[PDB]
Amino acid sequence: HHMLKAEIFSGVIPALMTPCKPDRSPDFDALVRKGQELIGDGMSAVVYCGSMGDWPLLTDAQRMEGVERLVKAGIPVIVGTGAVNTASAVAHAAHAQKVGAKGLMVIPRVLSRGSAIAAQKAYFKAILSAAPDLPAVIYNSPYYGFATRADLFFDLRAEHPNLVGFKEFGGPADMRYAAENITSRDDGVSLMIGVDTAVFHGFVNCGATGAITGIGNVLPKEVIHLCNLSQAAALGDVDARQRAQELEQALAVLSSFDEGPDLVLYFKHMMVLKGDKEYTLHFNETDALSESQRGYVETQFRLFNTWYAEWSKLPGAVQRCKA
Amino acid sequence: HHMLKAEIFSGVIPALMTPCKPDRSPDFDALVRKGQELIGDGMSAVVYCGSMGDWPLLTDAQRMEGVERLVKAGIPVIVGTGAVNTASAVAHAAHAQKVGAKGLMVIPRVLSRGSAIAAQKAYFKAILSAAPDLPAVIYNSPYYGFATRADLFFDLRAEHPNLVGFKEFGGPADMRYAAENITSRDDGVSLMIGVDTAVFHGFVNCGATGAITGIGNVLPKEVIHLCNLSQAAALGDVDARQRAQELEQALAVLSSFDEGPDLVLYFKHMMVLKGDKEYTLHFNETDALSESQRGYVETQFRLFNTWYAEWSKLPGAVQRCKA
Amino acid sequence: HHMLKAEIFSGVIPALMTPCKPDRSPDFDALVRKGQELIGDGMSAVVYCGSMGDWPLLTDAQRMEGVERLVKAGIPVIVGTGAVNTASAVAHAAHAQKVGAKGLMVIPRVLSRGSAIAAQKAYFKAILSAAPDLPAVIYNSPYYGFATRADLFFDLRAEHPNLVGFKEFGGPADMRYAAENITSRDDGVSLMIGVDTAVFHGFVNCGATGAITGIGNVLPKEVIHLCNLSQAAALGDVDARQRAQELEQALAVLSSFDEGPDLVLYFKHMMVLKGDKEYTLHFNETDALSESQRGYVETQFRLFNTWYAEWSKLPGAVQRCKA
Amino acid sequence: HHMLKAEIFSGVIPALMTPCKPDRSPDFDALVRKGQELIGDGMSAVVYCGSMGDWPLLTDAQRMEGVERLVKAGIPVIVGTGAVNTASAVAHAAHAQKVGAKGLMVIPRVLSRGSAIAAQKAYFKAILSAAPDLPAVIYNSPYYGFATRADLFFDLRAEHPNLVGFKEFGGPADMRYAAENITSRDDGVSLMIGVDTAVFHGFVNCGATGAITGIGNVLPKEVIHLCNLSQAAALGDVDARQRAQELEQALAVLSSFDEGPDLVLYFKHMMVLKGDKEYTLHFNETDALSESQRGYVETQFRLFNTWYAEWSKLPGAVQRCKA
Amino acid sequence: HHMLKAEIFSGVIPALMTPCKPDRSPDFDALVRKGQELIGDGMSAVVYCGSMGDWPLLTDAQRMEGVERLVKAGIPVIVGTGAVNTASAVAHAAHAQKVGAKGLMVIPRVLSRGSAIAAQKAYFKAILSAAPDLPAVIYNSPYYGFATRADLFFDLRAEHPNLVGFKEFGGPADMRYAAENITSRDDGVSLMIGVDTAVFHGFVNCGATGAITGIGNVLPKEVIHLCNLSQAAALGDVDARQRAQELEQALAVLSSFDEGPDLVLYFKHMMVLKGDKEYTLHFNETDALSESQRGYVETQFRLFNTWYAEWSKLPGAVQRCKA
Amino acid sequence: HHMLKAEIFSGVIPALMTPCKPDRSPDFDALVRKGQELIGDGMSAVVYCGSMGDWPLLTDAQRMEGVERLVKAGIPVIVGTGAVNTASAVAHAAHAQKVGAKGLMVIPRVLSRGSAIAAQKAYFKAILSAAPDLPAVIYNSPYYGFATRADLFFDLRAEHPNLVGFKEFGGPADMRYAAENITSRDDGVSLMIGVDTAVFHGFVNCGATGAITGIGNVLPKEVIHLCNLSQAAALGDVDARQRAQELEQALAVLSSFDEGPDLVLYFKHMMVLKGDKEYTLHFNETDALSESQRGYVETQFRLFNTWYAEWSKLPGAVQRCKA
Structure with missing residues (x-):
């Protein structure tokens, strides 16, 4: 069969941070405000609660409250099922379906039997089974x-027709593996870019349908610009292929913070640099960038912004592909 | 200064499994029974709730109930602080001190900032600070x-005098690193063997004071025998050095299950083979050994038991060092 | 079901060398003589034509002639299907079944699509299908x-019930993987030791049913002795477990030539040192040990023989387990 | 001495595929037609029978028939000597000289003694000696x-003056090693690019004289364009250096199929997409791209063709360097 | 505090070669001439005696004579402290301070206790303590x-306020580590590029203040051009960011000789190709490029020079940023 | 030809430490005393000045004085040629021949061109040429x-007939490589054990003629005992093969200090523990074991001595093979 890809996995999709209130509990009002803003900027959906959202630091109830709030605001939500155990992951999935989220991000088993493929297969089945109506x-x-x-992917999909996508945070060779062997069938399966540094490679070299973004929370217009240029390049455009690569290269240092353990520290600090004070505190009192880390990101943020202010005036694909 | 090593980190110490009731909730009565039995067999303390105890599959409340039950039974308990977040780990530590556990097993930060050393330092400080009176x-x-x-270890110990030990699950070179550079000072610091395959190396080559054991839940007398022989070898005994190595080698396959992701599946199945039916079920309904895995452990369990039945009759150190 | 393991994959089984006539064509009369001798010495079967037999240097017709000759002599033969292409491998298998060989050694695809698992699956299916009646x-x-x-192994076996074994030439961890996950089911599947250095580990730690041997062509009685001791150790015998390891250790250097590219050069030279002049020449005129290699193997062959002459007089398991 | 490089190793040189007749025997008429076409397109020579030509799947007689046919058609042929054994490789070389092929591609020993350098030296000597008059x-x-x-290279060349080149399929560092240490002497030695992804690096950074191409069978004009631009860049041209890199980058995914085990599956399928139906079947009945692989290459082939159709209209070096 | 970076570690700084007289002793007159020339060309300082200067081949007295000569000529000198032992390194540092050198390059301990971090800490302290007034x-x-x-860096700097910089010869990830975690504080610390291939990455992605250069001895104007363009790119310039990368890429092969063991052989030969005959001989009579190495560098030197002659005429940032 | 191995490379040979006087200059009187003592204990020769002797910390003159003193005392001396440059290494070799040392230890080039094989070949030639009469x-x-x-080894030996041995400090596989490919010819070439942990493997598995020892400075009788047992095992003795391995295993931790950067710190401290106070100080004022390192070696030294005191009373090969 030839099947349409799932619309929820198309476009540019921020994995939202959870802002803290002054008492270091989640500020759900602020979460919804930012989600609405980012959709307004041109994002197609959001992911909540993923690693960007500090999932291990929040209770399941808190995550589910945030999901509910976002869905009730009319934001298309892909729910993160990261969990300490099967029962928790399944609860996230069941809640996603109950409240009318639009998609599911299936995260593997951790801490208990993590490297066991037999365990992963059963865990994925349990999660998919809990939200059968959600892509x-x-x-x-x-x-x-x-x-x-x-x-494994096709054995799961044979029993779980809702499994329609594959999100790669690993390197370009792993994304290439997925494109060549999984996501290029006729059957409605989508490759999603899952790390900020792989946008061009994903869309152009790997046939990706969409990108889940960390840095796009901070620089939504610039990340949408890159995604648009990269999609135009995937149609064969000459100018866009050149411009996409220029923009990715300039974004590379800021995007590379998404690859490391401190991604939430870096991206919340950048939110603060853009004037969003609610991103000041972390759930853990001692989690903070070091002085050098703060200086490094400040320098690099200024550099990128200065370069983009002039580069983004160029004629041709650069104008055509703005958000 | 020259300081006595902490007695709680001496001897042979099982990391207890949590048995399931038929509804796959914890059977605390059975946990206490086994803990008492193992102390009676010659174990010096127990660890609860560690990875052997399925900590990620239990709520914090359940773990704390188990700790309470064991302590109230008069069993010396080292509390496992494994957790999804700082607040949880600190709660485990605070509870350990409150109820009169005898020691603390400090597990690093996971899932959020795991590879960041700055994060680990703060996390360890938070945990140690929560139970200052517990080694x-x-x-x-x-x-x-x-x-x-x-x-890092000595910077922590300078501010946290309760930090008095170092438990290595890694390879022999990592245990050697610890002995050479951390645990051989005069100052009351203990190296603990933290994987079942490193007992002889730990006691004889690395100066270990005690062993935390997985397989010792199943084969307590045989593991105490190995530890005793290895400690006698550490005094310079010729016979014990030879016999310890023979016994470790024979135990090696069964001990090696402690190194892998399926350690709880293997060791609960061995408990069942020895007649303890309460170790039949797992907290997750689908977690089970495969047919080949079950056959392999059954074969190897029979082999070891047959060999030990005759080897354990030999004169000399083999008799002297029995539990 | 519980099924008997295939008898053809039990015991000690030399992978025969092909001796050269003076014109560097195969000496089939000599091949049959050695095969008969080795069965007489206590070997259970032979493998022909494997890498020990110089398969890439012989035509398919020559290999098939050798197989025919061995089978007509009443020797139990496991046929090697190593080949440059599918059609060749399938021809070897079909011939094996036609002439009444007793088993099949299925060698993977080489030179074309070697690393492609999809290719390997089809290739194995083609070979197994060509000799359905042969284990x-x-x-x-x-x-x-x-x-x-x-x-892959179980998917093949579901469609090809003749697939009943798994021969590992790789390291001890790979043999362990097979024992734990493939060969310890109740269903009649056999692990075979497939490198000379893994005999004790295979029988005792991995449940192996038999060994295919290179060095056993040269030292049949000594290799059968090691296999017998190792099988007795697998029953739980204390003495045999110690003696097996002593014998394996003494054999280790000579056995290690089986791991390298020059195995046929080393083992043919050892045949010559034992008085079998027909092992002097190689099919390729320039293939020969270097002066140092020849000196090394001569020294090590003398050393082993001297040690064994005295060790093999010891009482207990050493006498009980002789060929 | 200063010596002219061998003309046969200059320019752009497809390693031809062997098309199948409907009965999966070689279609030699079609082989010659394509060889003639590719020379007409601007290729300087062809390689037959290399891995692109499915050498392990063909008999020596079939390969030699193809070589004869190509030579009799007046095509300059470099003969591939890949073989299962020395006698076969030497036969290919001797036949090449007999029939008037113009060059020899010396492939190392496989399957028997492959990693032994002593074996490789003798094998190369045997092959070179068999066709002394062929570069x-x-x-x-x-x-x-x-x-x-x-x-090794210079020891061979001292005794075999026909050894005049060095074809690297390995990575850019290995090509750099060859340029720095082997092929940059004054003495008439040529570095040949031997993988499709290394064209620019080879010509510009490594002094290559020519390229043996897989993808150039499918996209001859575009590959000649890249080679021409890269050679102009090697003269110091500014525009060509920029344009060469743009073209290589756009060709990179299609070229990367040359690096993997499925190169013949991918490139025959691309031949089919360009209308050459004789490239439909493979010699092995079950060798075929998967559904995803077929989708991936189709997508990427369309993308490249669309990009090239517009990029190839640009003024400057892009026009100057067309085939 | 916010502190000015040390001016001596800014700009472009050749690590000078030591030219030989015909008797293979150092030609100090020629050393001073080249140092003066390079400052005149636009270099800000020189390093002497570093690995480029053949430090292990010279006596301490010879190195100190060269330093004295350069300082007395009015050249700003950063002294290399590479040494066989602590006493030697400390003597170099003490002499640097005595004679009025402007900076110190602190090289780690070698040959004795090299991998011991405890040794390195004491060694660095000894060197820094010997020249407290020199950055x-x-x-x-x-x-x-x-x-x-x-x-380690911050523990040293706390006791040795003269430690104000960090020179990375390792890969881009190591330079990134330094920028993120060491050199981006407010406190006057400088990252220096310490390998010729990392100039753009250092200035733009890592905040470097200056570059110590090997190839810049040979191509000073071109290396200053690259550094200037890269510094302009670090301000956010669009044109310079593109041009810097073009120039670095064209310089990449010549710059890559700085990464290998033969850097002095390659760079002295390039000095000879530019007409400086005093760079003909090496201190060791047999140290020389091979014929292929000489051909390779000659080819690549001609290529770069031809490309630069035309590229350097381009309008815009290319003109603005010339030395 | 069949040639006698060089006697100077036979037996057990300490690489002497250089004791310090209280002013941290070499105590040559003490060096000679220890050298004489060790020969008296049963050592066959000494090596001076090797890494054990702190060569990088001493001047060439100091090393040569020590060599002279040892030779004039009638001790057979193998001279270490470790050096910062060719001229230094050659001077050591020339002096060795001048004063009547009995052998030469040729150490490769360091610090300048270290990884360049062309450099190493010339450097070895220069050193060998300087002392043609010394093995x-x-x-x-x-x-x-x-x-x-x-x-390389045989190309050197063809021009330098004094090159008659090969000293391996690397792992067992590297020693095996040497035995198989270099040192097992008939031609008078000797493999020497060059790390303390490889004694049994060297003599029994690799045909070694002698051992250069670090730990043997401290425990000469015990190391000679191990070497004697291992040589008897190399003759085929059953008892000695078992006892050698027991003794090596017990010595393994103390011997392993020879593998690391702190070997001189550990072995001088052990000399002090045995009552030789002249081994207290190091040439560098701050070089010292840490508190944990000191505790570790003290514990392990006591353990070994206690075990050996009883094990060394056993009958059979243990008595026969004492020094």
């Missing part, structure tokens, strides 16, 4: 000590 | 994407 | 740029 | 488990 | 079997 | 960033 994407990362390859 | 051991493993080396 | 073992080695894991 | 290039690849370095 | 940069390289990380 | 051994270690393999 689902599996996250694949070497962080888990195992890879979901084509065999 | 504490830090667990060190490559699983965490970072190592606690001498610099 | 078959798949050879697994990192040399091929891929591993046959449990999933 | 010869040695193929160097990590696939063989050994590298031909300067010492 | 100092520590060289960091994997060549030493250890890395100076932030902890 | 010479080349040291081979991965520390140098290159390996001397058979090709």
